[PDB]
Amino acid sequence: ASTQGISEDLYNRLVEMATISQAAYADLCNIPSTIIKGEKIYNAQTDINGWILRDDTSKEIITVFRGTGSDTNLQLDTNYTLTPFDTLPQCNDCEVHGGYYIGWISVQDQVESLVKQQASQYPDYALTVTGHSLGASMAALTAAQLSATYDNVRLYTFGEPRSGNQAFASYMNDAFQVSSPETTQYFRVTHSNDGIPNLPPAEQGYAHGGVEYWSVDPYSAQNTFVCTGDEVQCCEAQGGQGVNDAHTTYFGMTSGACTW
Numbered sequence: 001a002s003t004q005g006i007s008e009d010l011y012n013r014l015v016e017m018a019t020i021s022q023a024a025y026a027d028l029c030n031i032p033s034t035i036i037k038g039e040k041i042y043n044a045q046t047d048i049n050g051w052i053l054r055d056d057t058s059k060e061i062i063t064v065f066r067g068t069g070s071d072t073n074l075q076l077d078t079n080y081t082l083t084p085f086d087t088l089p090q091c092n093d094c095e096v097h098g099g100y101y102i103g104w105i106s107v108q109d110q111v112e113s114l115v116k117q118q119a120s121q122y123p124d125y126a127l128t129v130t131g132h133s134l135g136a137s138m139a140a141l142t143a144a145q146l147s148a149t150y151d152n153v154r155l156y157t158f159g160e161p162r163s164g165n166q167a168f169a170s171y172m173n174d175a176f177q178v179s180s181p182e183t184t185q186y187f188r189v190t191h192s193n194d195g196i197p198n199l200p201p202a203e204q205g206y207a208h209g210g211v212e213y214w215s216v217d218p219y220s221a222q223n224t225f226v227c228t229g230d231e232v233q234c235c236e237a238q239g240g241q242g243v244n245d246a247h248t249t250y251f252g253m254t255s256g257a258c259t260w
């Protein structure tokens with residue numbers, strides 16, 4: 001099921017997180033002045049790049065992951081082997097994208113250490129996780145893990161692949177109160193005919209979770225649909241193939257462009 005239009009406040013929030021996600025491809029160029037840039041999350045073997053950030057105006061600790069910026073990352077993006085989410089064994093029968101799992105395990109210890117330190121210094125701040133493309137699925141896996149320790153986790157993804165199986169989607173839907181858009185803490189943002197939310201195919205055992213926020217052109221609050229349930233609709237009905245122009249440009253911002 002679907003409805004058309006979101007609040008300006010929600011729209012501006014999605015745009016803000018899309019900006020951070022797209023700036024992650026260029027050392028967080030031109031992000032708002034209200035954000036303090038913390039430690040760089042990095043592993044050389046997987047070439048996973050991200051940052052922990054803090055916004056004292058919105059009272060959030062933000063973890064952002066860069067999507068693919070190297071052939072090393074591409075090797076992760078294109079590994080569709082499902083694997084048990086063994087870092088979070090309380091996620092029963094949960095399996096995740098095998099490449100993104102390899103990325104996640106390479107940075108888990110650093111991510112968890114940084115979040116723990118910052119949350120201890122700022123205990124009433126929300127914990128927000130975000131990213132685009134590969135970074136979106138890194139954000140999904142990270143948010144799943146964090147949700148088991150912290151009660152105030154929010155996830156904003158852009159052009160997110162199917163990150164795992166239905167068990168994993170269901171775990172995430174429960175953890176992030178996805179059953180109503182009024183309560184959801186998981187905003188799965190899609191754009192027009194972006195091909196990447198169609199991959200890997202559901203036929204290989206993959207599923208999405210979250211409430212889908214489907215941005216149609218010309219982008220605006222009024223032209224963003226809210227898509228709920230597991231019927232084929234919205235981005236996943238458009239037949240987009242792979243990395244197309246819709247994938248690279250969310251709310252008019254192209255990955256790494258730095259013209260915002």
Ligand SMILES: *[C@@H]1O[C@H](CO)[C@@H](O[C@@H]2O[C@H](CO)[C@@H](O[C@@H]3O[C@H](CO)[C@@H](O)[C@H](O[C@H]4O[C@H](CO)[C@@H](O)[C@H](O)[C@@H]4O[C@H]4O[C@H](CO)[C@@H](O)[C@H](O)[C@@H]4O)[C@@H]3O)[C@H](O)[C@H]2NC(C)=O)[C@H](O)[C@H]1NC(C)=O
Nearest residue numbers: 075078079080081082083084096097098099100101102103
């Ligand atoms: C795509 O993603 C998926 C999911 O993330 C990856 O699949 C996992 O891959 C790992 C690594 O191969 C695999 O782990 C093996 O499990 C076996 C048990 O079933 C182990 O026997 C095996 O041990 C060998 O490799 C380890 C190093 O990886 C060594 O520590 C160990 O000593 C063993 O070493 C022998 O074999 C290796 C490999 O032939 C050889 O190099 C050594 O010299 C020695 O002969 C692994 O631990 C998991 O089973 C996979 N999970 C699933 C669900 O399939 C996959 O690897 C990703 N693709 C890429 C390219 O990274």
